[PDB]
């Protein structure tokens, strides 16, 4: 079978703004 075939959602909804800043920072753990 194929996931992306319809697992990526046909609507395709973009992020908000907190997901980009988080994924942009990177670090895995957050010192503190």
């Amino acid at each position: 079978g194929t996931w992306i075939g319809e697992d990526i959602f046909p609507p395709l909804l973009p992020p908000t703004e907190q997901d980009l800043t988080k994924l942009l920072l990177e670090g895995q753990g957050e010192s503190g």
Partner: protein, 132 residues
């Protein structure tokens, strides 16, 4: 065009079409701050709905999902500094063979500056406390 450049970034989407992470290691080599601003702006336009039509990201999604590869046109946007620059995005389906994970969509974003705007301003730091 060509293989000359560096200002760019990539994105990683899971089998849910959601963003799992972003790779901007390239932008770090540019030595030019504001990468986050350019990354968000470019991504905002790429995922922006074309009027009555669906966003570009959607078009590349169905194309990369039905063909395995897609690329959007060159869009223009204004940075926080009023700088007008254009960029493009491409989606590439990738499925894990070794690891027991699910396939993800890799979205590469290339930056394209219309006019020359990279003067020798490599002098943001200098002090800190008391150097030699």
């Amino acid at each position: 065009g060509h293989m000359t450049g560096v200002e760019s970034f990539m994105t990683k989407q899971d089998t849910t079409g959601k963003i799992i992470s972003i790779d901007t290691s390239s932008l770090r080599a540019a030595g030019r701050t504001g990468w986050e601003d350019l990354v968000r702006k470019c991504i905002y336009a790429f995922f922006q709905p074309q009027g009555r039509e669906p966003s570009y990201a959607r078009q590349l999604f169905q194309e990369v999902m039905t063909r395995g590869t897609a690329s959007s046109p060159s869009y223009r946007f204004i940075l926080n500094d009023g700088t007008m620059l254009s960029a493009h995005t491409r989606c590439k389906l990738c499925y894990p063979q070794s690891p027991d994970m699910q396939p993800f969509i890799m979205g590469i974003h290339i930056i394209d500056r219309e006019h020359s705007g990279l003067s020798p301003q490599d002098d943001t730091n200098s002090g800190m406390s008391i150097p030699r």
